Structures are given as C-alpha cells and as structure tokens.
Design a binder for this molecule. Structure first.
Ligand SMILES: [C][C]N([C][C])[C][C]OC1=[C][C]=C([N+5](=O)=O)[C]=[C]1
Ligand SMILES: [Mn+2]
Ligand SMILES: [Mn+2]
Lengths: 137, 137
C-alpha cells in the first residue's frame, strides 16, 4: 500500500538559478548538492532538482495544467506573493475561485502555486456548490 | 513560510482511465469525481486529476526527468512492483541510482516511482557512496 508522496523531482536546465530560486527565494532547506542535482526539503516535502539536458525553459502556453502547490498560511500569503512580485517572478494564471491561490513559474517554467486550505475544506465547499457532474464517495 | 506540498495536479487526456489507474491499480482513495476532474488522496497527499486536452503522451525517452515518487514499505515493495508488471504497466529509466525504486508510467506518460526510504536514509547512503562533486550542508 502506498503511504504518501516520497519525493518530487523537477528536471532543471541550470542548477545554480534553480537552487537560488528554491533555497533563497522560496526559503527551502538545502541538504546536499552535487554536479547534477540537489536535495532540498520544505516541511515534510523532499524536493530533488535534477540537471537534465532535455529540459527546456517552457513558456506557460506550451505546457499543460500539471502543477505543484505549496502550503502557506493565510496570514503569510500576501507578503509571500509580494516577495515573488518584487523578484519579477511570472504569474501564469489568475485565481478565479474562492480561496487563496497564487500561480507562479519557476526558472524552467514548472508551474507552481501557493495555496491556503486543505482537501477537507475544498470538499466542504464543493458539497455546497458542486462542479458539473460531481459525485462524492 | 512554506510548510510542504499542498496538492499535486496532473493533467490527463482521458479522465476515466486515469481515475481507474490511480484508484483501482494504485489503491488511492477516491473522494470525488466530476466531468473534468477528480480528487484522490494517498496518505497525506492530495492528488488532483484535471482533464486537459493539451496533454500529450510523449515517449519517456523524449520527456525530461521530472517525476513523482510514492512511499511504500520494504515488506510491500516487491509484491507491489510485481503486480504493476503483471498488469502491463510500462517502465522508464532514470540516469542515476537512488536506492530501492521501481519506475513506471501512468496512462498519460507521467513518470512515477515506488521508493523505499526517507530523505535522511538517502543522505546517509550518499555519505557512504557520494555522487560526483557532492557536498553536504
Ligand atoms: C464522458 C463523461 N461523462 C458523461 C456523463 C461520463 C461519466 O461517467 C461516469 C461518472 C462517474 C462514474 N463513477 O462514479 O464511477 C462512472 C461513470
Ligand atoms: Mn492547484
Ligand atoms: Mn526518484
């Protein structure tokens, strides 16, 4: 039986700007680096950056909706979003729902999100106003 | 302050075969499904499947090393991997060894992994046989 997410690995085109982004801008802990990768943590999350000559810097129009959302408290949300804006980090989507989300891109065009709230909160909101075709189990 | 992964969203080309893969084959818990997505959980992980007509199925040889690893116990690893092979799930290959892992593809070509072990265990293993140029912090 699977017990959760073990690690998330992102392919990166250049290690130094990606380490700067995840460690310095986003505040993750850097545990180790080598010639072709790095290991970081963010709370319980184990993040691996893997240098990959196949990775292209991808504009958001040319990638699909696959994305990775990080947890943040509502109290910290606005100041963290403002930090990303000061650093010139690009936004790939406006939040058009109820709930706090900020959609931003990493240096290689991986699609990231800051989100406040849990699965249980989302399910409760959907029970009140379900999406088209929605069935609960 | 970021505190971990809030959710992982995968773009899928066909909802029904993807829900079947994650729920019926991988054993994740299905909480809700609607015409254009589904919510599942795997332990603490909130997984969203999002129907996206922009999702393309790319051979693993021409997609980058971005991948998602799920935790499994030492006792369950071999039998779970055998069940995936018996079900005809395709494999892919990483450029480096990272311990006890099985690498497999989902129906849309997302790169998945079963892995036994924590970040702390990986760091201890790397201290005994480091990658090229490795530094520990
Ligand atoms: C083609 C998209 N949809 C049109 C109505 C099909 C929906 O079809 C199902 C929904 C839910 C379950 N179910 O909950 O197992 C099974 C089938
Ligand atoms: Mn999201
Ligand atoms: Mn891996």
């Amino acid at each position: 039986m699977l017990s959760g997410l073990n690690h998330l690995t992102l392919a990166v085109s250049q290690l130094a700007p990606s380490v700067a982004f995840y460690q310095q801008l986003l505040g993750m802990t850097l545990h180790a680096r080598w010639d072709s990768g790095a290991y970081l943590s963010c709370g319980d999350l184990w993040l691996c950056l893997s240098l990959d000559p196949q990775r292209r810097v991808t504009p958001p129009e040319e990638s699909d909706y696959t994305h990775y959302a990080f947890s943040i408290s509502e109290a910290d949300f606005a100041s963290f979003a403002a930090r990303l804006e000061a650093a010139g980090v690009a936004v790939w989507k406006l939040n058009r729902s109820e709930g706090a989300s900020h959609y931003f891109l990493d240096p290689d065009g991986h699609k990231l999100e800051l989100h406040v709230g849990s699965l249980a909160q989302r399910l409760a909101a959907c029970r009140e106003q379900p999406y088209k075709g929605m069935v609960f189990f």
